[PDB]
């Protein structure tokens, strides 16, 4: 009855939320348990905390091809959320899935900028498609913790107190999404017959905002005007890949420059998800 | 009387995060030290702000800014620190601040392990607390169950071994294994208990005083399988590196159990309503 899901990378930022979202959806949830690399107290405790919620642990190693095959044979769907070298370990996962033969869908570690735009992620896609593994690519949003809570400033995760850099004129549309919402959309789409072999864009409508609109949401919550320093494009390219990431998002507008139909956008596919709006998101910092 | 306001220092540490939640559970108005970011540290930031949803307040302060420590402690009645273990010695700056503010009714320094006065920068911190005249409680005497029980006291891992296990000496030295949650709850109960002002509190839940070989047997009965044991002489063990030695005092010298403690200084008796987790329940999560 339940879809059986294996979550790969279950102790990461996105992966842990995907574990929880799969359980909250009612999926029978399995989490890949990799051989310890270190005395890692919070890693181990996070993993075992999942059992208390009803998840099961499956031990396997990426260096052990047969242990991966044994793992994926126990589930119906695989979701990966590796850090993004670590993206490429999914190639081992693809061969294991291809050998196993029983996987109905694979969602690789995407959850960001679409890599098919004119990349290790694209190499994983090709292997998936070469093997004929049904897939769903979840893309198109900035994690609110990495880009909204710091008003998109680099090198920090919390609002600045007095000053703020604005990229260009800060009128390039961006997509700011609470990581919990991304995970819940992921749990809902992964067995949806409508999203088989599709790209799903996480673009909740009211969270499509320019940097300046984000800052102005904050300024209205606090009642304080920030001192703004506009940084021109070339002023931003003083760098001789993470500056590259910001440049594509805030200068090239790579998240919002192509329109998406309702049949491929998460908030339209799953309108019951009451996604967190950025004014609510930012309240925790007041 | 009223809440009793507590500032937790090291609030995103292993022990500190449990202490934050314990203080909220006990009904204290709970404040957490927000230190300036040293890096893009997503899980550290999310942990800190998760406390707000639970009713805690954050106070930004820096150890390198004496005036920010003063201001932070001036907003609370009690201070509890749980720094990793230099980390220890930064508490000296905190004592100077506590000294100047002059409103702190009690300070619990970062202890929660072997009593150093029976073996240290912890002792240095004690000396400063006492020289300054700051009322104190020292919480000592227990092995964290995550570091010593879930691995059956094996080094280099935190989960039960699959078939063989090392026995230190004869595995008949008494050790104290306690759930970190219980340590934190005892800490939140004791920090304003008049019976423990200016005392050492020993966390020694009676049913959790166990030999390594007893711990192993609890697990063998849970799994129904016996484990291949190999014993290891003190001298062998000591064949030449501070983690080792922590273990040696604990499992060879028996430093946690070689002295008696009285009920008016033992947490499980001071706080008998804390139904502490026994090791047979603790280990079940691993099955
Ligand atoms: N704004 C946005 O849209 C963002 C996009 N992303 C993307 O989301 C996806 C997940 O990112 P994130 O949550 O930050 O990932 P994490 O950095 O949190 O790592 C997650 C897990 O990946 C496993 N892992 C990492 N390296 C290796 C390795 N060499 N070998 C084996 N396993 C490894 C580990 O799994 P285990 O739990 O088993 O130990 C680790 O816990 C990525 O594709 C990333 O590009 C992430 C940041 C922001
Ligand atoms: N078996 C046992 O009984 C055990 C005993 N202990 C003892 O418990 C106490 C706390 O240990 P534990 O919870 O594991 O420690 P942690 O390593 O988990 O504590 C980390 C926190 O302490 C702060 N910290 C660390 N270094 C610094 C620094 N240079 N400057 C400022 N802050 C710093 C940070 O505070 P912030 O959150 O604000 O960023 C950090 O988050 C210690 O006294 C330890 O000796 C701990 C392990 C096992
Ligand atoms: C907030 O300050 C920073 C934030 C980051 C976040 C990095 C941002 O680019 C992020 C990212 C990676 C992959 C993506 O597909 C992605 O899509 C938005 C974003 C990185 C996530 O770790 C990097 C450097 C910083 O200084
Ligand atoms: C579980 O494997 C290890 C576990 C540790 C735990 C270290 C154990 O000695 C612990 C300790 C530190 C301070 C203490 O006061 C203490 O009292 C028991 C124990 C250390 C806590 O970080 C160290 C090395 C290991 O290989």
Author numbering:
A (entry chain A): 8 to 91, 97 to 130, 142 to 263, 272 to 317
B (entry chain C): 7 to 91, 97 to 130, 142 to 262, 271 to 317
Question: What does the article say, verbatim?
Answer:
Pinoresinol/lariciresinol reductase (PLR), an NADPH-dependent reductase, converts pinoresinol to lariciresinol and subsequently to secoisolariciresinol. Here, we present crystal structures of IiPLR1 from Isatis indigotica and pinoresinol reductases (PrRs) AtPrR1 and AtPrR2 from Arabidopsis thaliana, in the apo, substrate-bound and product-bound states. The crystal structures were captured in the apo, substrate-bound and/or product-bound forms. We found that, for all 16 structures we solved, each enzyme adopts a similar head-to-tail dimer conformation, strongly suggesting that each PLR/PrR functions as a homodimer, consistent with the literature that TpPLR1 exists as a dimeric entity in solution. Each structure contains a head-to-tail homodimer, and the catalytic pocket comprises structural elements from both monomers. β4 loop covers the top of the pocket, and residue 98 from the loop governs catalytic specificity.
Regarding the mechanism of the second catalytic step, we further compared the structures of IiPLR1_NAP_ + PIN, IiPLR1_NAP_-LAR and IiPLR1_NAP_-SEC, which revealed a similar mode for substrate/product binding. Furthermore, Leu46 (corresponding to Val46 in IiPLR1), His276 and Phe277 of AtPrR1 are positioned similar to the corresponding residues of IiPLR1 to effect substrate binding or product release, except that the β4 loops cover the substrate/product, which are disordered in the IiPLR1 structures.
